[PDB]
């Protein structure tokens, strides 16, 4: 219902990866699937993800965050990878079940 | 209609023998065109140290005329009717055959009978085909794949007769004489050892009829009806390495002793060899190919190409694989391979074979794609198996094979067997018989 | 059941269906198409070529994976064959599996996804696929000839040029399929099958509408020479002139004049006396060489001439002799009997080409796509002997007059220029 | 030279007399610009008939003299601007070899206009080969040529090259006042002829780039 939806928004501001300018999928741990996905990213979307991180890293090193006005907002967060990933995973799931 | 049936409609292949030894067979169709040929059971395997190169020097003059109709005449008369006359000669099976319109079925046979029996052998022609063979060598020498396979033979069967090149020695081709050529023809090209095969829109009777008329030569003594049985060829685990870091790639070929034409096991073996199959750069398959080795080969740029083989002979045979690679991957590759070999002997699954079967199945079917290849199947069948093996049979023999079967046979022929090794090129990365032997067990 | 009959329906959208059950244990279905590097513009070269290798790439109904593993699982095979103007997708397999091999054959030619990555990850292959073919000088000289005998379409090379390797795009490919692989330019020819199955499948699954999509730039003849110095030991050469189109009754003349000059050997390690050209050259050259009659027939044009191969020192005389032997042939030096022979060789050659399941599916196809008709074997043999000694002596003349195009490769040091013949 | 040099004399190995061919070489390369040069046998070295081209060279416009200029003293250039809309460049090509030489123009343009830019390059050469050369255009090209030459003797390298070439092809040295004499000794005819010796003979072409809308030699 509109609970999980008002919950998710909270948690999102809670994790606070926005304070660093990082999109939801910027903080993803890079296992084999993700790796694969990231390689399928359109030239730009990747060069962009890149900056964001090299910038976040620069922050964590300085110990500071972004001024309030530059933070990502729960609804303006672009899940630029989620689709490519579910495909990688979908693809893999196949190869696996087919080898029997 | 189902596959099982299209299999039994194929017209039973007919056969009859002449009281002189020749045997005649052929499969009738509807095609207006066809192919016919004589399938002699001759070859260098029957040659000795002094005459190595006859089967070839002959195969070279079998198209330059006869006594009835010299050079031009022969060719002229053949070209002028559109027929195609080609031939070959392995280590133990020479063959001359013509492709032409079913209409000329008879006139053709006449010609075939004229090459095999009344070969010209002009002294001006030989001393000319001498310079040529000598050239087909400087050339054939640069075909690594073959320079290897010969070496493989040359040491796998080392010391015996099988271990000789078909084209024969350089000295021999330089000294063979009208005389020596004659004997080869005389001593080897004999009816009880020849087979008249053909396929196309021909009537069986019509065919044999022609035979009766040109393949005359009726014999007296029992000697002439006897097929000289051949001396056994000793397999010997070993290697021969020809190095030249100046070559672009290196070819390697590994093998074990084969079972010999007759054995019903060759089936299982071919089923196996299908599991590993073969690969080559251009294969669109790519990383999704089913052959484990093919897959790995791709993922790690292991090799330009590789292939499995099951060369069979009267009493023996070679069984293994050959691959071409970069001087810096010969190792990894070899290794992956010997492993896939092991896998076979230890954990081949019902799926691995299910696919293998279906593959072999349609491969054997494509062996009969046209008149020439169908004919060849017959020429070779009679001469080796002693009759004709129908796809209906071949197929049943395959439907029989399952995992357990393969695992036992491969083990039976591969597991812990001293192998024959032949390498050629910039082969430094691959370096040890021992280490290789060690790779023949456990997975 | 030996003899059946050859059917051939033609749906509304223009999708020609050619059947023929010959009861062989194995079928061979295919999709011929009016496609090729002749519809390529400067801006999108080789996109034809890549499309050929892009065959195994995922579709809207099957993964790069499932396609290859799915087909191998039955002992199948998938191959793409194409000329400058005709692509041919076709699978082979055992009868009891055709059902499944079809899904992919269909999916491949009708619903490709051409994912950005699967593609850019496949382009380097062009570099390769190209490098192997080119080991045969045989093919290098042909590439150049076409570009040296044309201004467009047919002049376009069959293997993506070097500069464009890696610059082809997913869009570029697509627009090449949406704009060419249309029902009216497609033909679903099949052997070892019932016309009822092939049809049913062709209609219930196929989509992409008809229409010539994008007409091809009419073939303008140029007629120039392309000499490629490469130090290589042998000199290959082909001198030709505008020929006939596919179907012109004039084309059958060259097809006979082809055999009249000698177009290949019939006896291993032979001398081929029924070869004017060959024999004609031996009476001038001393060392090993080789010469033959060249002949191609394209929808709106064609080529014709001879192709030599010789030692670089004799390269000259071997080519000059190749001409003088073509002149003395264009001038009443053709026995009414040479013509009678070439007719059988031709009747023959053709007939033997229908032996290999692949060779048959090609004849049925070509015809079934360029007209949706099928000329019986007795009719074709009729349009062959319907040739006069004149049509031949004329074919030979239509040559010595028109503008000629040349192509070479090798130590062309003692080789001649077009203007010196 | 004397006391130290060795390697004996003699023309050693004569050079294969230059046979003229006259063909075209088109190189498709997808590159953004199309370069092209259409020429015909020109004069040889020291052969009076060259000085004409050397003047017909300047008459058609053989390069700029004002940075980022328009060069109005360039028939060819100006001639092309009156046909093309986008950036391009064209000039007079001229080479003189001992037993032959070449002459024509060389263009460079966007691939879409490549055609018209070349075609215009020709029509501008015809309208030039046919009495469309002011007896004054000729008087100007003469200075530009007297000049260009004279400035080439400034750089020690430029001088050692003039002295050499001459000093090797004849073992002579024509004073600077004599050379300038063989220059103005040119008639408006020699020029209009040079321009004619072009439109008639067999032409040779060369290209490179997206030659998609570029023309073939046979279409001029």
How would you describe this structure to a colleague?
This is part of a larger assembly, with one copy of chain A (100 residues), one copy of chain B (443 residues) and two copies of chain C. By secondary structure, chain A is an all-alpha fold. Chain A has four helices and no strands. Chain A has helices spanning 4-15, 32-40, 43-62, 82-98. The termini of chain A are far apart. Chain B has 443 residues and is α+β, with helices and mostly antiparallel strands. Chain B folds into two domains: 13-226, Cytochrome Bc1 Complex, Chain A, domain 1, CATH 3.30.830.10; 238-441, Metalloenzyme, LuxS/M16 peptidase-like (Cytochrome Bc1 Complex, Chain A, domain 1, 2-Layer Sandwich), CATH 3.30.830.10. Chain B contains 17 helices and twelve strands. Chain B has helices at residues 3-9, 54-61, 71-79, 105-116, 123-140, 144-156, 170-175, 178-188, 204-214, 265-276, 292-299, 330-347, 350-365, 371-384, 391-400, 403-413, 433-437; strands at 14-17, 23-28, 33-38, 84-89, 94-101, 195-200, 238-243, 250-257, 279-280, 305-312, 317-325, 420-425. Chain B has a six-stranded mixed β-sheet with strand order 1-2-6-3-5-4, sandwiched between helices. In chain B, helix 2 (54-61) crosses helix 8 (178-188) and helix 13 packs antiparallel against helix 15 (391-400). Chain B is globular. Chain C is an alpha+beta fold. Chain C folds into two domains: 1-209, Cytochrome Bc1 Complex, Chain A, domain 1; 221-421, Metalloenzyme, LuxS/M16 peptidase-like (Cytochrome Bc1 Complex, Chain A, domain 1), CATH 3.30.830.10. Helices cover 38% and strands 16% of the residues of chain C. Chain C contains 15 helices and twelve strands. Chain C has helices at residues 47-53, 64-72, 98-110, 116-120, 124-133, 137-148, 170-178, 195-205, 251-261, 276-282, 315-330, 338-352, 357-370, 377-385, 389-401; strands spanning 8-10, 16-18, 26-33, 77-82, 87-94, 186-187, 190-191, 225-226, 234-242, 289-298, 301-311, 404-407. In chain C, a hairpin with a 4-residue loop joins strand 4 and strand 5. The N and C termini of chain C lie far apart (59 Å).
């Amino acid at each position: 219902g509109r609970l999980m939806d008002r919950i998710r928004k909270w948690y999102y501001n809670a994790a606070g990866f926005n304070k660093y300018g990082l999109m939801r999928d910027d903080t993803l741990y890079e296992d084999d699937d993700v790796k694969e996905a990231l390689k399928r990213l359109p030239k730009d979307l990747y060069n962009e993800r890149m900056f964001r991180i090299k910038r976040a890293l620069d922050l964590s090193l300085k110990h500071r965050i972004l001024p309030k006005e530059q933070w990502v907002k729960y609804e303006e967060d672009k899940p630029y990878l989620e689709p490519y990933l579910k495909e990688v995973i979908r693809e893999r799931l196949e190869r696996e079940a087919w080898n029997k | 209609a189902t596959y099982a049936q299209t299999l039994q409609n194929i017209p039973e292949t007919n056969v009859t023998t002449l009281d002189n030894g020749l045997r005649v067979a052929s499969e009738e169709s509807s095609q207006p065109t066809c192919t016919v040929g004589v399938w002699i059971g001759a070859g260098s395997r029957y040659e000795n140290e002094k005459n190595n190169g006859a089967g070839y020097f002959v195969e070279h003059l079998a198209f330059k005329g006869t006594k009835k109709r010299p050079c031009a005449a022969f060719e002229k008369e053949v070209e002028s009717m559109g027929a195609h006359f080609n031939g070959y000669t392995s280590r133990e099976q020479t063959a001359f055959y013509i492709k032409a319109l079913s209409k000329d079925m008879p006139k053709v046979v006449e010609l075939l009978a004229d090459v095999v029996q009344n070969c010209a052998l002009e002294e001006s022609q030989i001393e000319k085909e001498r310079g040529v063979i000598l050239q087909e060598l400087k050339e054939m020498d640069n075909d690594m794949t073959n320079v290897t396979f010969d070496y493989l033979h040359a040491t796998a069967f080392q010391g015996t007769a099988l271990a000789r090149t078909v084209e024969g020695t350089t000295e021999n081709i330089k000294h063979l004489t009208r005389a020596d050529l004659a004997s080869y023809i005389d001593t080897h090209f004999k009816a009880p050892r020849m087979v008249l095969a053909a396929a196309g829109g021909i009537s069986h009777k019509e065919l044999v009829d022609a035979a009766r008329q040109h393949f005359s030569g009726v014999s007296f003594t029992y000697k002439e009806d006897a097929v000289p049985i051949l001396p056994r060829c000793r397999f010997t685990g070993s290697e021969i390495r020809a190095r030249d870091d100046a070559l672009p790639v290196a070819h390697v070929a590994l093998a074990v002793e084969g079972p010999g034409w007759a054995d019903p096991d060759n089936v299982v073996l071919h089923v196996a060899n299908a599991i590993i199959g073969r690969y080559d750069r251009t294969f669109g398959g790519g990383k999704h190919l089913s052959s484990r080795l093919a897959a790995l080969a791709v993922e790690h740029k292991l090799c330009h190409s590789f292939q499995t083989f099951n060369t069979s002979y009267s009493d023996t045979g070679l069984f293994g694989f050959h691959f071409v690679a970069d001087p810096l991957s010969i190792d990894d590759m070899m290794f992956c391979a010997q492993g896939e070999w092991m896998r076979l002997c230890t954990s081949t699954t019902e799926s691995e074979v299910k696919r293998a079967k279906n593959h072999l199945r349609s491969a054997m079917v494509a062996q009969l794609d046209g008149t020439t290849p169908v004919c060849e199947t017959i020429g070779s069948h009679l001469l080796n198996y002693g009759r004709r093996i129908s796809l209906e049979e071949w197929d049943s023999r395959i439907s029989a094979v399952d995992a357990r079967m393969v695992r036992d046979v491969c083990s039976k022929y591969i597991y812990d067997k001293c192998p024959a090794l032949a390498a050629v090129g910039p082969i430094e990365q691959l370096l040890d018989y021992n280490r290789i032997r060690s790779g023949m067990y456990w997975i | 059941p030996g003899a059946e009959d050859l059917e051939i329906t033609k749906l509304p959208n223009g999708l020609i269906i050619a059947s023929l059950e010959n009861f062989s244990p194995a079928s061979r279905i295919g999709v011929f198409i009016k496609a090729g590097s002749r519809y390529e513009t400067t801006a999108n070269l080789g996109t034809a070529h890549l499309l050929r290798l892009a065959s195994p790439l995922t579709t809207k109904g099957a993964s790069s994976f499932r396609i290859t593993r799915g087909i191998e699982a039955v002992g199948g095979s998938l191959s793409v064959y194409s000329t400058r103007e005709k692509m041919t997708y076709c699978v082979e397999c055992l009868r009891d599996h055709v059902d499944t091999v079809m899904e992919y054959l269909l999916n491949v030619t009708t619903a490709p996804e051409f994912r950005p990555w699967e593609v850019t990850d496949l382009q380097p292959q062009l570099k390769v696929d190209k490098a192997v073919a080119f080991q045969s000088p045989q093919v290098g000289v042909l590439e150049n000839l076409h570009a040296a005998a044309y201004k467009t379409a047919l002049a376009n090379p069959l293997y993506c040029p070097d500069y464009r390797i890696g610059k082809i795009t997913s869009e570029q490919l697509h627009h090449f399929v949406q704009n060419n692989f249309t029902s009216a330019r497609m033909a679903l020819v099949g052997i070892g099958v019932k016309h009822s199955d092939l049809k049913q499948v062709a209609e219930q699954f196929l989509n992409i509408r008809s229409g010539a999509g994008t007409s091809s730039a009419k073939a303008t003849y140029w007629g120039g020479e392309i000499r490629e110095q490469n130090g290589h030991s042998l000199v290959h050469a082909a001198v030709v002139t505008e020929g006939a189109a596919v179907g012109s009754a004039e084309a059958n003349a060259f097809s006979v004049l082809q055999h009249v000059l000698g177009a290949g050997p019939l006896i291993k390690r032979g001398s081929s006396v029924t070869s004017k050209l060959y024999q004609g050259v031996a009476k001038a050259t001393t060392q090993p060489f080789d010469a033959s009659a060249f002949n191609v027939n394209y929808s709106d044009s064609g080529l014709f001439g001879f192709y030599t191969i010789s030692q670089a020192a004799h390269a000259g005389e071997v080519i000059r002799a190749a001409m003088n032997q073509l002149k003395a042939a264009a001038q009443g030096g053709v026995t009414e009997e040479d013509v009678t022979k070439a007719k059988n060789q031709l009747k023959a050659t053709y007939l033997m080409s229908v032996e290999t399941a692949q060779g048959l599916l090609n004849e049925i196809g070509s015809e079934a796509l360029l007209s949706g008709t099928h000329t019986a074997p007795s009719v074709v043999a009729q349009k062959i002997d319907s040739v006069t000694s004149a049509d031949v002596v004329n074919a030979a003349k239509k040559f010595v007059s028109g503008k000629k195009s040349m192509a070479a490769s090798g130590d062309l040091g003692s080789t001649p220029f077009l203007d010196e013949l």
